[PDB]
């Protein structure tokens, strides 16, 4: 496959470069470690209003104040 690659690199290097960039752009995001970081970065953007919920008295996760430790934090993007 080396002779064929040398031949196409000698004839038209633009096609070889374009196909190399296309293959890199295809196979690298499937091997990327920061794609899930992009997922939570997009998911953590506060576009609309975070409306509260009614209380039946049984909820261990949601807080009553924004500064309470209960609830999700955003420390991972602050450090990164």
């Amino acid at each position: 496959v080396a002779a064929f690659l040398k031949n196409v690199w000698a004839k038209e290097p633009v096609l070889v470069a374009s196909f190399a960039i296309a293959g890199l752009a295809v196979i690298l995001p499937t091997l990327s470690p920061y794609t899930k970081y992009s997922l939570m970065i997009n998911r953590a953007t506060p576009y609309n209003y975070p409306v509260p919920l009614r209380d039946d008295g049984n909820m261990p996760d949601v807080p009553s104040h924004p500064q309470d430790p209960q609830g999700p934090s955003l420390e991972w993007l602050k450090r990164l």
Binding site: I41, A44, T45, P46, Y47, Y49, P50, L74, L77, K78, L80
Partner: protein
């Protein structure tokens, strides 16, 4: 007598062949320079885009805090 004559020693050598210099770096050098510039730009854009996302999140949470009075 006096007449138009070349001198006693004659005229000097005159260059008449092609002389191209042949100059610049090797192609590996410009390829490495371009790749390094690409990597540096990618890193700087990465850092500044992350900072911009943080600032946008801060502005959005300020907007969310300001909403109920409006």
């Amino acid at each position: 007598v006096k007449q138009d004559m070349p001198p006693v020693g004659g005229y000097g050598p005159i260059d008449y062949k092609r002389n191209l210099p042949r100059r610049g770096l090797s192609g590996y050098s410009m390829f490495a320079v371009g790749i390094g510039a690409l990597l540096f730009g990618y890193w700087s854009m990465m850092r500044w885009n992350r900072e911009r996302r943080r600032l946008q999140i801060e502005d959005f949470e300020a907007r969310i805090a300001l909403m109920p009075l409006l």
